[PDB]
Amino acid sequence: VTMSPESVVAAAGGGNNNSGYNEPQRFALVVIAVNHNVIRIMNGSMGFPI
């Protein structure tokens, strides 16, 4: 991923009042994935074969 000039200029402080980036800013990256699986129901019990 590539950042932006707005992000790099807002990372530091210097913003005036009611600007949001008055204090130095920090960012974090989060990744979510969705996957398929098979659930087996038999003999009154459940579990993943794989």
Next chain:
Amino acid sequence: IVLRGPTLAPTLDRTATHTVTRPRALGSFHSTAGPAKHAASIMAECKDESR
């Protein structure tokens, strides 16, 4: 492409099914018995001084 030992999850069996809870065994150790007995007292039918 990556090759590795496939992950196999064991299944079947049964957990927490039809609780019975009957492990008790009767029996204990204490005194045996008591050897006590009594008679029917003593009767007395005598008078008139029959020698």
